[PDB]
Design an enzyme around this catalytic site. Sequence first.
Site, PDB file in Angstrom:
ATOM      1  N   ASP B  50      13.289  -0.504  -2.842  1.00  0.00           N
ATOM      2  CA  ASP B  50      14.034   0.133  -1.780  1.00  0.00           C
ATOM      3  C   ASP B  50      14.687   1.438  -2.239  1.00  0.00           C
ATOM      4  O   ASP B  50      15.766   1.532  -2.828  1.00  0.00           O
ATOM      5  CB  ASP B  50      15.100  -0.796  -1.238  1.00  0.00           C
ATOM      6  CG  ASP B  50      15.803  -0.133  -0.058  1.00  0.00           C
ATOM      7  OD1 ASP B  50      15.122   0.184   0.930  1.00  0.00           O
ATOM      8  OD2 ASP B  50      17.026   0.054  -0.133  1.00  0.00           O
ATOM      9  N   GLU B 125      24.538  20.748 -25.052  1.00  0.00           N
ATOM     10  CA  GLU B 125      25.666  20.342 -25.877  1.00  0.00           C
ATOM     11  C   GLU B 125      26.421  19.187 -25.250  1.00  0.00           C
ATOM     12  O   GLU B 125      26.404  18.959 -24.038  1.00  0.00           O
ATOM     13  CB  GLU B 125      26.599  21.483 -26.060  1.00  0.00           C
ATOM     14  CG  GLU B 125      25.914  22.610 -26.762  1.00  0.00           C
ATOM     15  CD  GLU B 125      26.617  23.939 -26.566  1.00  0.00           C
ATOM     16  OE1 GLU B 125      27.035  24.297 -25.459  1.00  0.00           O
ATOM     17  OE2 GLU B 125      26.733  24.644 -27.560  1.00  0.00           O
ATOM     18  N   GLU B 206      29.680  21.557 -32.808  1.00  0.00           N
ATOM     19  CA  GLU B 206      29.871  22.791 -32.068  1.00  0.00           C
ATOM     20  C   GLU B 206      31.280  23.359 -32.149  1.00  0.00           C
ATOM     21  O   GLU B 206      32.095  22.801 -32.871  1.00  0.00           O
ATOM     22  CB  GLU B 206      29.466  22.560 -30.621  1.00  0.00           C
ATOM     23  CG  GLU B 206      28.140  23.244 -30.331  1.00  0.00           C
ATOM     24  CD  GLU B 206      28.097  24.779 -30.451  1.00  0.00           C
ATOM     25  OE1 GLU B 206      29.134  25.444 -30.337  1.00  0.00           O
ATOM     26  OE2 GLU B 206      27.010  25.345 -30.632  1.00  0.00           O
ATOM     27  N   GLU B 214      25.893  19.135 -31.135  1.00  0.00           N
ATOM     28  CA  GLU B 214      24.591  19.607 -30.684  1.00  0.00           C
ATOM     29  C   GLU B 214      23.453  19.111 -31.550  1.00  0.00           C
ATOM     30  O   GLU B 214      23.475  19.240 -32.780  1.00  0.00           O
ATOM     31  CB  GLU B 214      24.587  21.104 -30.692  1.00  0.00           C
ATOM     32  CG  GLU B 214      23.453  21.729 -29.899  1.00  0.00           C
ATOM     33  CD  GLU B 214      23.551  23.251 -29.895  1.00  0.00           C
ATOM     34  OE1 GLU B 214      24.662  23.762 -29.999  1.00  0.00           O
ATOM     35  OE2 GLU B 214      22.537  23.945 -29.800  1.00  0.00           O
ATOM     36  N   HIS B 263      21.557  25.982 -22.754  1.00  0.00           N
ATOM     37  CA  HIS B 263      20.774  27.206 -22.596  1.00  0.00           C
ATOM     38  C   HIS B 263      19.292  26.931 -22.567  1.00  0.00           C
ATOM     39  O   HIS B 263      18.763  26.292 -23.471  1.00  0.00           O
ATOM     40  CB  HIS B 263      20.915  28.211 -23.720  1.00  0.00           C
ATOM     41  CG  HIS B 263      22.320  28.615 -24.117  1.00  0.00           C
ATOM     42  ND1 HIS B 263      22.658  29.677 -24.850  1.00  0.00           N
ATOM     43  CD2 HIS B 263      23.468  27.964 -23.730  1.00  0.00           C
ATOM     44  CE1 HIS B 263      23.973  29.646 -24.887  1.00  0.00           C
ATOM     45  NE2 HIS B 263      24.450  28.647 -24.228  1.00  0.00           N
ATOM     46  N   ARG B 329      25.947  39.382 -26.400  1.00  0.00           N
ATOM     47  CA  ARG B 329      26.210  37.962 -26.059  1.00  0.00           C
ATOM     48  C   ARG B 329      27.512  37.985 -25.234  1.00  0.00           C
ATOM     49  O   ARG B 329      28.657  37.973 -25.676  1.00  0.00           O
ATOM     50  CB  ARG B 329      26.435  37.028 -27.296  1.00  0.00           C
ATOM     51  CG  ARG B 329      25.343  36.905 -28.378  1.00  0.00           C
ATOM     52  CD  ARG B 329      24.602  35.568 -28.605  1.00  0.00           C
ATOM     53  NE  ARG B 329      25.328  34.408 -29.149  1.00  0.00           N
ATOM     54  CZ  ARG B 329      24.756  33.506 -29.973  1.00  0.00           C
ATOM     55  NH1 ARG B 329      23.549  33.662 -30.508  1.00  0.00           N
ATOM     56  NH2 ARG B 329      25.421  32.396 -30.288  1.00  0.00           N
ATOM     57  N   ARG B 349      21.287  31.869 -20.894  1.00  0.00           N
ATOM     58  CA  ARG B 349      22.475  31.193 -21.405  1.00  0.00           C
ATOM     59  C   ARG B 349      23.355  30.451 -20.421  1.00  0.00           C
ATOM     60  O   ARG B 349      24.122  29.599 -20.849  1.00  0.00           O
ATOM     61  CB  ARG B 349      23.372  32.170 -22.120  1.00  0.00           C
ATOM     62  CG  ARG B 349      22.772  32.759 -23.349  1.00  0.00           C
ATOM     63  CD  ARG B 349      23.932  33.321 -24.102  1.00  0.00           C
ATOM     64  NE  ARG B 349      23.802  33.037 -25.519  1.00  0.00           N
ATOM     65  CZ  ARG B 349      24.746  32.390 -26.208  1.00  0.00           C
ATOM     66  NH1 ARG B 349      25.800  31.762 -25.681  1.00  0.00           N
ATOM     67  NH2 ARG B 349      24.582  32.253 -27.499  1.00  0.00           N
TER      68      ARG B 349
HETATM   69  N1  LIG Z   1      28.959  26.152 -25.867  1.00  0.00           N
HETATM   70  C1  LIG Z   1      28.693  27.445 -25.250  1.00  0.00           C
HETATM   71  C2  LIG Z   1      27.416  27.978 -25.851  1.00  0.00           C
HETATM   72  C3  LIG Z   1      27.631  28.252 -27.340  1.00  0.00           C
HETATM   73  C4  LIG Z   1      26.620  29.149 -28.035  1.00  0.00           C
HETATM   74  O1  LIG Z   1      26.289  30.230 -27.524  1.00  0.00           O
HETATM   75  O2  LIG Z   1      26.208  28.755 -29.123  1.00  0.00           O
HETATM   76  C5  LIG Z   1      28.560  27.382 -23.719  1.00  0.00           C
HETATM   77  O3  LIG Z   1      29.578  27.013 -23.091  1.00  0.00           O
HETATM   78  O4  LIG Z   1      27.508  27.725 -23.168  1.00  0.00           O
HETATM   79 MN   LIG Z   2      21.432  29.920 -27.712  1.00  0.00          MN
HETATM   80 MN   LIG Z   3      25.336  25.532 -29.044  1.00  0.00          MN
END
Ligand SMILES: N[C@@H](CCC(=O)O)C(=O)O
Ligand SMILES: [Mn+2]
Ligand SMILES: [Mn+2]
Lengths: 445, 445, 445
Positions: B50, B125, B206, B214, B263, B329, B349
């Site tokens: 179901d 993560e 991390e 991670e 990411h 970044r 990202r």
């Molecule tokens: N933890 C980060 C990413 C960290 C990284 O770029 O290694 C996020 O909030 O996406």
């Molecule tokens: Mn990355």
């Molecule tokens: Mn990371």
Amino acid sequence: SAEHVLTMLNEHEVKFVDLRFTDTKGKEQHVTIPAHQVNAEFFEEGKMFDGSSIGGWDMVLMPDASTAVIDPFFADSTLIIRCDILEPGTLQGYDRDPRSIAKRAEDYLRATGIADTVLFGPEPEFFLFDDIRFGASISGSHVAIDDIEGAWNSSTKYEGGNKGHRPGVKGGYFPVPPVDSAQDIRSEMCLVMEQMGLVVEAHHHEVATAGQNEVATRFNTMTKKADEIQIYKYVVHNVAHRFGKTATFMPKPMFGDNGSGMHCHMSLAKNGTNLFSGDKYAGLSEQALYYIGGVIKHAKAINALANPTTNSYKRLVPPVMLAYSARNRSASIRIPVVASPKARRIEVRFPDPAANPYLCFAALLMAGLDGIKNKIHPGEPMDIPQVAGSLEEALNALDLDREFLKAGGVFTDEAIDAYIALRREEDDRVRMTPHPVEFELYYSV
Amino acid sequence: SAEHVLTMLNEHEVKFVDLRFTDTKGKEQHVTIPAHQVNAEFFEEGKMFDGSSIGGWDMVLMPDASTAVIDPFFADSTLIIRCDILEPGTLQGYDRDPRSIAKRAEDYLRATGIADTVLFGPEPEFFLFDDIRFGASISGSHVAIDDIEGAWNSSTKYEGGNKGHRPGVKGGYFPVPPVDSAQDIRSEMCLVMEQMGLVVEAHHHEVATAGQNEVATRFNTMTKKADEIQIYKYVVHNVAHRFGKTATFMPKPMFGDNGSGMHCHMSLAKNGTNLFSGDKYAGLSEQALYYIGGVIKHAKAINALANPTTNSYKRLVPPVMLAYSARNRSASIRIPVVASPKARRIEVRFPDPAANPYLCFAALLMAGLDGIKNKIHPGEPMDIPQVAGSLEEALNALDLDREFLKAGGVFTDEAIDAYIALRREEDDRVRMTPHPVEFELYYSV
Amino acid sequence: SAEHVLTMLNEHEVKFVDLRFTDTKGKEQHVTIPAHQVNAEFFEEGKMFDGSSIGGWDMVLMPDASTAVIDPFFADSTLIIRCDILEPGTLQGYDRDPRSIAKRAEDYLRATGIADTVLFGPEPEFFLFDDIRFGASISGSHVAIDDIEGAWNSSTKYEGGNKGHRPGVKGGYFPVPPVDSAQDIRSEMCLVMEQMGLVVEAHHHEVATAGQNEVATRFNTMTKKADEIQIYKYVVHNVAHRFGKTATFMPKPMFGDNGSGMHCHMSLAKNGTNLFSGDKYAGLSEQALYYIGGVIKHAKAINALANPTTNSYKRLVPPVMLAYSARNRSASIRIPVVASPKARRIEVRFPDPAANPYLCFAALLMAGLDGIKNKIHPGEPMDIPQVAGSLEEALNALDLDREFLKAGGVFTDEAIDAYIALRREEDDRVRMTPHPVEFELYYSV
Ligand SMILES: N[C@@H](CCC(=O)O)C(=O)O
Ligand SMILES: [Mn+2]
Ligand SMILES: [Mn+2]
Ligand SMILES: N[C@@H](CCC(=O)O)C(=O)O
Ligand SMILES: N[C@@H](CCC(=O)O)C(=O)O
Ligand SMILES: [Mn+2]
Ligand SMILES: [Mn+2]
Ligand SMILES: [Mn+2]
Ligand SMILES: [Mn+2]
């Protein structure tokens, strides 16, 4: 060699490889790869990581295959490999990476032809506590240290019973068990250090109540010894942990009793011979006297690296005297009475375990060479100038006496500036936060 | 093949077979059959269930025999078989079943001839806590997070003693044990993931205090990787559980420290060659630049699937910039410096572990193809538009930018409408319930 | 007059004079002078204060001697004098001071000749709790509301005994004592309000469980009524306090039960006659219909001032409909069935007690005049557009629909920009802090 690491992997059924490196502050960092990712490519072109979130710094981790050790603590079979941080593609080595800076200081020594090798022998002390609580908030702040050996626990109710054999405040120096609670923890630390490639010479309790200890370890060449200090610290932190204790290398955790210092024994050698031995004061060469003169000439800049914490200066209060002596243990440069042959060496008593062993040793060497290099004659033995009286002083001093560190590209300006920037942030937090004895001193104003 | 599953059953004395599937929200569902019900009929005409009480949806579970894995945790020998939800009798596949939608997006890629395969590499993560309590009622609401590594426990009395080595708030990035408490929990997670068919590349702590971790895992084709994220999450949730911890993939559990993002590394390939490699910016093809242009063109609609929780946007506060770069970044599209050959790829990202990996990956692919398909030229690298600033915005955006998802029958209107309906109910509960900092801000009005 | 204040000082043996003013957010500020500093000079050239640390703003406090009231609560005899913030030396009145802005809106009404006076009748509701605890930290957040009347206390052990008469969740509307615990607290609030110059019309319990209450008070001209709301709030906060309760004017403290709104009854008058009375819908003039049309035309910009808290919008969830009606209480503009003569008026149901009464009333008036001024015909009565659905929306709307507020110098651009700046900081803290029901919704993702 790569070849060798690759056999150990099968020879030990290694499930993981732990890539380790040291940051600017001195803390050993690590990332873990499955053993099945170690192959030619790896030892060839390293592994990329985001160097950006390391304090004070994409970059490449370059595995140094000479450093392979099996980890005595992780549950799954792991082979530790120390790495160097290299500038990516171009592959030269971050001028802010402390291991690279140490290696550069060793090659610069060779390029000057003053000697082939630098020998370092650090004597790091540590504390082994049971409970450490602390904190700072808008409404206040505190730290609370506790250990079974703390002279203060003589009054304590324990439910097993109190048993009362304990080192008094300056009485931790040497009594047999049961007053010394740590005989098995230190012997175990010795056995795991040797399993990781270090050579223990002696281990004993130190002067302080509440767990001060020392594992004495055989010397080495500068960068190799600096890595041995990173393994030393790792074994002390984790064996203590297995025993239910907590270890700390901070210079001065308790007011009113001994601090933990890391004295550096140093010596220089050209073609298998000890340049520090000779005629002159207490078996020393004229060569050695200029090394002392360079250390004393640059002491306050060295303090920014050898005593890098605001807490360091709680220990360095009135080995503060910049003076050499075989007699005065009050002089920060002791010429050890070797008596023996050409184990002749100098001992700088003022650095502490908080120091980044790479940058601390590189700075002592560069200062000592600038002495030789300019005949900076030390003076006469006290049997009178002092170390920096605070981290802020030490940081100003490094900032102005920057030249001897830049010799031969060991340490760039960006490297020295980023370092002072980190240490300043720390100094400020300590400077702006009200201290508990200020309430004792000034609340009823 | 059926044949193969049927041998494993004897080859492992499998007592039960666990039929698993993923719902619209992304949570892996499961129902259990005794091994003795697996026979021809089963892999032929599936099993009826179901479907009605699954959120957002009689139906048929069609076992995909390629997916058979033994469960590393249940006490009795169990073989997991992933299933597709098919429309019954007629047997085509629910147009609201996320795995079917992923498979459709892969076939549509083939039918356009732009490439044969899509390669995805998610970097999920997670947080590993000891205690999580929360609740909402008429008289109030609360959440309380706790973990041994929480910088806030520096002041805590523990009865074992406090021991004090702990990651500070942005200091979880990389220190060796004992500061990193999870080395054995992550290595164990790596070993069980591989036992379930994943290939671990690296595992590390991390940036955040209080247990951010991670486990990095080798890429795959889109639908296979989306299933590998469902196994990834299952192993992290259950190994943590065996260790007395609780793991969470929610994007932003703590204000004032890092969030957990997932990411997505993406790449396209035609006849064994990487279409994203080429000339242009940083080794990229013109083909790749239009993929980026499609992702940026449809970013806010993608956010409704790649960032599907109101909490997602607590993380996405000022990688918010829709821009590509090898340098910035801060740009949500990073072009990784591969340096290496034709591992050339783009990295988006902004998505997070809360995303349904099938719908999230299908939407990134469909957006990226619409870029190629219409020469939607990205622009110039920042070395300026942003992601949806809230789930409500993202849901409006998906509702209006609905076209690129409907291409080739990947995603119907009913499918997109039912999805927005689910996410809206959630958004409303969060919108109508008073927040604790509002009492801080407005009680004395 | 000064003369009058100076007699009250002797006539009441006033020991202190309390200078009071309202800031941009709406909170009444105060500073205290000894009575012996009130003399000519004072009412002439005011008193200087550092305006710099008032949120959103040396300046001069100019005492308005018409406002002198004796404080019913301070232990020593104190005379309250409301002040205006003037620009120093030059003496014109801060264009960011909400009382000055209210006075300007009244004079602009006169300068347009549309009427001589604006009459406002706010209906503020409040909650009267026993205990309110809340807090937000890195490891979590909470709010806990408690009151003896909370339907949730039916299960509570009390040690006096529980006694069980309590308003159920939407059942606070009207039951006699003992279900209504606050008869004496509201009557006392009525008597102290009148002692401070207000005229009470009625007081009663409101719909919500856990202490919702209302003291209805006779109308006034706009700036005088805006000051009467500041006294209203002061008496409610301090009488509640004397009774061991805590009162709050925040719009929505509890999910699942009534919110506290402050409905504004408005009317316009030229030479002693009510311009809102007439023919047209329900006794209204065409003049009045354009006032409604201006309010509806500018509703979302008005929301930034009449509903200025993120919590406001927890109340304004689906009187959201921008529509007038004598019938539809769902329409945010109610035309009250006066039946009676030329007490004809409009009632805007959507503002709440968190609103700065000066800026809230000034904005309703300026919007209503722009309707008249441009024949902005409202439409037809519902017996369809809505208020801003969030503070961020309301703030964008004020920022773009800025023109009607700037008419005649009532509100400058700096004034509107500084206001949005304050409200944005608040919106952000609420937007970036994870909410407890998000853990309920997303922890097991
Ligand atoms: N933890 C980060 C990413 C960290 C990284 O770029 O290694 C996020 O909030 O996406
Ligand atoms: Mn990355
Ligand atoms: Mn990371
Ligand atoms: N612990 C001492 C050193 C003790 C010694 O000289 O043995 C210090 O603070 O440096
Ligand atoms: N308390 C309601 C108003 C009640 C009424 O219309 O009497 C509000 O939230 O505005
Ligand atoms: Mn010692
Ligand atoms: Mn020594
Ligand atoms: Mn009411
Ligand atoms: Mn009303």
